[PDB]
Amino acid sequence: VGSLNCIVAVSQNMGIGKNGDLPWPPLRNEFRYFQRMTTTSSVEGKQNLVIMGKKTWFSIPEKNRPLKGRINLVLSRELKEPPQGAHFLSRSLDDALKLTEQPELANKVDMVWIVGGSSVYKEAMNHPGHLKLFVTRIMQDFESDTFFPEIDLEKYKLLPEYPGVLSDVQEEKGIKYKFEVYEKND
């Protein structure tokens, strides 16, 4: 198993969700970027694992579930089996990560991507180790009910560039946004 990474899109006021959807109208090229970065392996014959919470799973349009070409694992302590379409179910972040180190998965998984929501991100971000955050900055305020945890800039360094990631400002439907990558190692 290779890298651990978080990926999120976040408004200026730290917003990630509202009423079970995103705070902003759909940005196709943002979703396209998410799909590309999560799906692309850097190895041959291995797949990336995506780890998400239960509400994140059900916020994905059913036609896009499971996220194709990735191993989809959902976190929940209430569910007793993976949701229709999902692959694995785990009861904690330690267990999903322990689970990747099984003979079954260990030589099948390249990257592991945590794709939301707030509690999964907070635990990973505050756990010692090598972790990168792929953060799309949505360059305005949007009314939100679910937020991204604080990024401690003393530990996470914004990288000045990264392969396969545009640095420049983008715009779709009158909303400007920008792709960033952060890295810690502690």
Ligand SMILES: NC(=O)C1=CN([C@@H]2O[C@H](COP(=O)(O)OP(=O)(O)OC[C@H]3O[C@@H](n4cnc5c(N)ncnc54)[C@H](OP(=O)(O)O)[C@@H]3O)[C@@H](O)[C@H]2O)C=CC1
């Ligand atoms: N802008 C973006 O990049 C993103 C946006 N979103 C949006 O954000 C909001 C969804 O986020 P949020 O409410 O934070 O929900 P989550 O996706 O984190 O789901 C929360 C549920 O997941 C289960 N859960 C979460 N963490 C764990 C864990 N570590 N171990 C076991 N179970 C866990 C619990 O379910 P149970 O109670 O069954 O134990 C909890 O009630 C939605 O609006 C969504 O559309 C989601 C991802 C990214």
Ligand SMILES: *[C][C@@]1(*)=C(*)(*)(*)(S[C@]2(*)=[C][C]=C(F)C(F)=C2(*)(*)F*)[S@@](*)(*)C2(*)(*)(*)=C1(*)(*)[C@](*)([N])=N(*)C(*)(*)([N]*)=[N@@]2(*)*
């Ligand atoms: C979690 C998420 C988004 S929600 C979402 C993802 C995939 C999909 F096919 C959908 F239909 C959908 F609504 S969009 C997004 C993210 C994350 N975690 N990161 C980024 N950059 N973008």
